[PDB]
């Protein structure tokens, strides 16, 4: 209850380092999905698929 | 269908038929501001992927 | 009237009856980029005011 039991969690490895996802985009082909703004900054570009 | 579609959202223009909505907890300017005190397994998300707001 | 409102852009949604356009100069962006060899007497003006192109 007070030790680092408390505040840390004990768990298994996984030497990936964590499973990270990537998006899609096909902005000049799809169009840009719900809330998604129209934009030509690479780094912002709609998503029109997630997957890790 | 006909005029049942329209996926509307602010202004952003009529969006019809099927298209995507996003649930990640990983989005960065959610972390600092809604779920700091949650956990992975029980998290609040922004479901608009609006840059402006 | 009616149908023959709608004042259109790229998926930035319908706006209706009388807006507004902007010629001006002063547009920092545009400078630099166009009217570099011109001058105030006779220059280009991007009157699309949207920060994302």
Request: glycine share 4%.
């Amino acid at each position: 209850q007070t030790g680092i039991r408390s505040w840390t969690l004990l768990c298994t490895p996984d030497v990936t380092c964590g499973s990270e996802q990537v998006y899609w985009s096909l902005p000049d082909m799809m169009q840009d999905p719900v809330t998604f703004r129209s934009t030509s900054q690479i780094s912002n570009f709609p998503v029109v698929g997630a997957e890790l | 269908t006909g005029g049942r579609n329209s996926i509307r959202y602010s202004e952003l223009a009529p969006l019809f038929d099927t298209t995507r909505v996003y649930l990640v907890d990983n989005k960065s300017t959610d972390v600092a501001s809604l779920n700091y005190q949650n956990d992975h397994s029980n998290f609040l998300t922004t479901v608009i992927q609006n840059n402006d707001y």
